[PDB]
Amino acid sequence: TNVYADSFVIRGNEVSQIAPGQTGNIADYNYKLPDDFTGCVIAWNSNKLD
Amino acid sequence: TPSALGKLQDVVNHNAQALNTLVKQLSSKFGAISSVLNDILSRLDPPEAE
């Protein structure tokens, strides 16, 4: 029905916190996903640009 | 001979024990951590509490 594409930049050891039900600085106070999140999490290294 | 009126005594005893057994199962722990809900939601994470 509708697709939302959230975009941001984090470190490498913080990519695991994007999964649902995780706990951390990025998961809690920066970007929280519900326990029943439907979608795909995509991340790639952008050290050459950022 | 109290067994004479046992027909109605059994009825009232079944009516009593059906409610007492129903409320006794409320304090049970079927494959769970605690019988009460306050000690589960405030101790476990939402992904696992549900």
Side-chain angles (χ1 to χ4, degrees):
Chain A
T1 301
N2 194 95
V3 179
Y4 294 108
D6 307 330
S7 60
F8 54 93
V9 175
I10 58 177
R11 285 200 299 258
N13 58 333
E14 302 171 350
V15 183
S16 61
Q17 298 183 4
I18 310 299
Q22 293 290 342
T23 304
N25 300 330
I26 301 302
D28 298 0
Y29 319 99
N30 297 268
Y31 188 87
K32 171 65 69 180
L33 288 185
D35 307 335
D36 53 354
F37 170 75
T38 299
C40 304
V41 177
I42 308 175
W44 66 96
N45 185 271
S46 62
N47 189 32
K48 201 64 180 300
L49 297 180
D50 299 329
Chain B
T1 68
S3 60
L5 267 169
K7 292 86 180 300
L8 276 42
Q9 183 67 20
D10 289 0
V11 171
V12 302
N13 290 16
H14 296 170
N15 291 130
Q17 70 181 182
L19 308 183
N20 299 333
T21 306
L22 190 65
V23 69
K24 189 178 180 300
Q25 299 292 150
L26 192 273
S27 62
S28 181
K29 200 179 62 61
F30 314 98
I33 307 300
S34 298
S35 300
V36 294
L37 284 72
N38 58 274
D39 295 357
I40 299 180
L41 301 179
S42 61
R43 186 172 56 182
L44 299 180
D45 50 320
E48 191 68 22
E50 60 180 0

